[PDB]
């Protein structure tokens, strides 16, 4: 088990065995959750080609840095921004400590960098739970692979929104891993989506899963990427089916920021 797993196939794919299947909990309506995507809002919003997202300065500066600042300043709640690497995280938030003078976010957020310390981690979670935007799980940056994924077992709904600045993705080292990719090409042919993309999206889903916790809570989770439709197919993220009666978990809108603030009013009302 893994909480969600409804598309079923990946586990029998990994096993080379066909377990007995069963869904063995009663789920809650789709409406307590909201799962957005962001890419731009006018036809001039061309800086997100992501042919070299690790090098595209204009793209980092435009909706990657600017949409985060618009969403965080407008939606004033405790929100953690997950990144694909430290290097992206460092470039996107100028912070108190900047990698260059030329970086494009100016706002009070907290860091979560390497040499994390078990005692130091708690200080940042004490700050996020207590008050203000900033803390661990609050207006703070962390890489999605990193320790923040363990979360905290507080009763208080410490988390509100998570904004994945880039879809969590991984690579395949030109050694034993490359040998594995070849083997699974030989056997599956459809190896890339199973071996890497789907496996990275679950990496995503753990962090968002840790934010919203279960049926007795509420939340939203946004993804920032050009290639995001591919991620929406095959039910590789939490958005997918659990009960036909639920009346769907749809996220299309002409403006994400407005839709989440309208959704938070809806949640206060409940």
């Amino acid at each position: 088990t893994s909480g969600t797993l409804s598309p079923l196939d990946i586990y029998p794919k990994i096993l080379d065995f066909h377990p007995v299947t069963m869904a063995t909990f009663t789920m809650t309506l789709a409406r307590v959750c909201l799962c957005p995507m962001i890419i731009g809002r006018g036809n001039d919003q061309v800086a997100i080609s992501s042919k070299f997202e690790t090098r595209e300065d204009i793209a980092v500066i435009r909706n990657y840095g600017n949409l985060l600042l618009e969403m965080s300043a407008v939606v004033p709640d405790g929100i953690v921004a997950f990144f694909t690497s430290y290097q992206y995280m460092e470039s996107t938030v100028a912070s108190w400590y900047e990698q260059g003078i030329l970086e494009n976010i100016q706002r009070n957020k907290l860091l979560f960098i390497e040499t994390q310390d078990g005692a130091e981690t708690s200080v940042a979670l004490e700050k996020y739970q207590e008050a203000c935007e900033n803390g661990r799980g609050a207006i703070l940056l962390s890489v999605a692979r990193g320790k923040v994924s363990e979360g905290i077992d507080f009763v208080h709904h410490y988390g509100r929104a998570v904004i994945m600045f880039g879809v969590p993705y991984v690579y395949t080292q030109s050694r034993i891993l490359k040998a594995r990719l070849e083997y699974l090409r030989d056997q599956f042919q459809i190896r890339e989506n199973d071996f890497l993309t789907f496996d990275a999206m679950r990496h995503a889903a753990q962090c968002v899963g840790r934010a919203i916790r279960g049926k007795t809570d509420y939340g939203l989770m946004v993804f920032a990427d050009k290639r995001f439709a591919r991620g929406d197919k095959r039910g590789k993220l939490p958005r997918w089916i659990q009960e036909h009666l639920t009346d769907a978990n749809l996220n299309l809108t002409v403006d994400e920021g407005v839709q989440v603030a309208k959704y938070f009013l809806r949640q206060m009302a409940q």
Binding site: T1, V20, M22, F25, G214, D217
Partner: protein, 138 residues
Amino acid sequence: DYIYPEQFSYMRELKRTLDAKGHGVLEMPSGTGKTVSLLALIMAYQRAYPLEVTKLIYCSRTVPEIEKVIEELRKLLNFYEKQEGEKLPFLGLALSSRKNLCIHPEVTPLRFGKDVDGKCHSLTASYVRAQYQHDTSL
């Protein structure tokens, strides 16, 4: 003396999902309720066969998640016996590496060629030697 409406709805199908005696896959919530409801769903089989009684083992990524499994399971049992307990007369335990549980054995034999297996062998050897004779010095 009861259990959840969810456990009652699911139980027969879950006992059946379990009958195949080799494997199965289970869909559950994003975390809250998942592990406790497993313990509630294994309460149906806590003694399925009296002549052998099978056991439960739980695999876990890190030490803070293990205390979440223990604290929930401690609430569900409430005690080992009918004297204070009402779902499971079970006995449960946490464990993790010798590398985590024990600091002094890591510290004292400080050398590069000193594997965590080897240190239990070393501690066992000092205990047998002390028992043999050398309690006063080894």
